[PDB]
């Protein structure tokens, strides 16, 4: 019954809002990973807070976050490696703590809070994103004005690489899920930010 329960829900938020089509969320939703010899390339980045990126908002969590003016809670983002069994490769997923910028660097990114993904070692890896805040609660919609609002950024990078026997696809997808941790709360409900009625009825 509680909205929070909905927040937990597995349902998937797209890594970054990239709209090949408005109609299909899918295109953004899956993020390609491919064999690339270069070292520390940026897989993807999104503002961690669900509101900003949008795909989060599209997700249940994002939607709910829109509902409540303030949310506090650790958010969890799971990533699933859709590639083939034969494939292997290692990735880095980092939360850049507020006060930092997006690292734009493998080294810079790595230090923050990160996990190292090992493909074949683990098909899926779980990133975790802590609640770090000056203020006890944060506001939902982050305008230019409110720093206190701002959660931070998430970025994915290639730790090692992506590698596959030829006979196997060069390219693969990763799918992103996200949820809220057990302790996650919202406040200051507002009129439905999540959905605005196209028209009201008499």
């Amino acid at each position: 019954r509680n909205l929070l329960e909905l927040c937990q829900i597995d349902t998937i938020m797209e890594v970054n809002n990239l709209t090949t089509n408005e109609a299909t969320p899918m295109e953004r939703l899956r993020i390609p990973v491919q064999v690339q010899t270069q070292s520390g390339e940026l897989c993807a980045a999104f503002k961690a807070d669900p509101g900003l990126d949008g795909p989060w908002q599209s997700t249940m969590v994002g939607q709910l976050c829109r509902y409540y003016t303030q949310w506090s809670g650790s958010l969890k983002i799971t990533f699933m490696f859709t590639g083939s069994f034969m494939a292997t490769g290692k990735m880095l997923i980092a939360y850049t703590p507020p006060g930092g910028s997006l690292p734009a660097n493998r080294m810079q990114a790595m230090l923050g809070t990160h996990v190292i993904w090992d493909f074949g070692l683990q098909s899926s890896v779980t990133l975790v994103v802590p609640w770090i805040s000056n203020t006890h609660y944060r506001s939902q919609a982050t305008g230019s004005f409110f720093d206190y609002y701002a959660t931070g950024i998430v970025s994915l990078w290639y730790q090692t690489n992506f590698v596959v026997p030829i006979g196997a696809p060069t390219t693969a997808y990763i799918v992103v899920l996200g949820s809220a941790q057990k302790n996650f709360t919202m406040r200051l409900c507002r009129d439905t930010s999540e959905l605005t009625q196209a028209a009201e009825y008499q």
Partner: protein, 254 residues
Amino acid sequence: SPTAEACGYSDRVAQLTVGNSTITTQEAANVIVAYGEWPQYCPDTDATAVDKPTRPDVSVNRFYTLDTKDWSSSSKGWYWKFPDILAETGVFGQNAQFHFLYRSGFCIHVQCNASKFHQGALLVAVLPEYVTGTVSGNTGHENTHPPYAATQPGATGFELTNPYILDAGIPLSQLLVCPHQWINLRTNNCATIVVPYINSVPFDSALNHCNFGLVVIPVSPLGFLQGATPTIPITITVAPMNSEFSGLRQAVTQ
């Protein structure tokens, strides 16, 4: 915690038992039970009917391998109306068509010929209400509406053209909210779900609108070399839990 890698689940095994059938698959999914419930038999307090129900457990409750569908690199999913599909086949179906009221949970097994390579996990879900809807002329003016044939897919479990079209209007992304057992197929592609359900409507004939629809729609594209096999079938087997029916009467497919 669950093994991170596998969509899985199950290397280990799964066994489904029902009357006059047992199925075991090495390439199986660990069972996920709906809403943490398990299918039960309607309580006396629960039941209005005042007719002694017939619970042919074994013949009725058992393994039907209703259909196989081959899977392409990507395919439009089809989803399977619960009541009808069994209905076509006996014994259950004959009784189901025969008898006005059908209510029961069932255990579902979906299996593919095991392939390691397979990727591009497919979403499987059951939805109680699943209430279909149309583009409505795509203007939205049209206000259009159901086939009877569509309503009763029968065994076939007629496919949904578009994944959000799957029922209803629910985006692939959002759909996850209703829980799925995905088959990544990255591991063995099998899913097991038992969906005990407490139905919204206290009773549904299911002679008509189906109690559940079981949906299968691929999240991620299968991707693969020229190098290896283009095809793998996906087959679904399900066995209902002990159902309750009332209204003996004559037989109607309806």
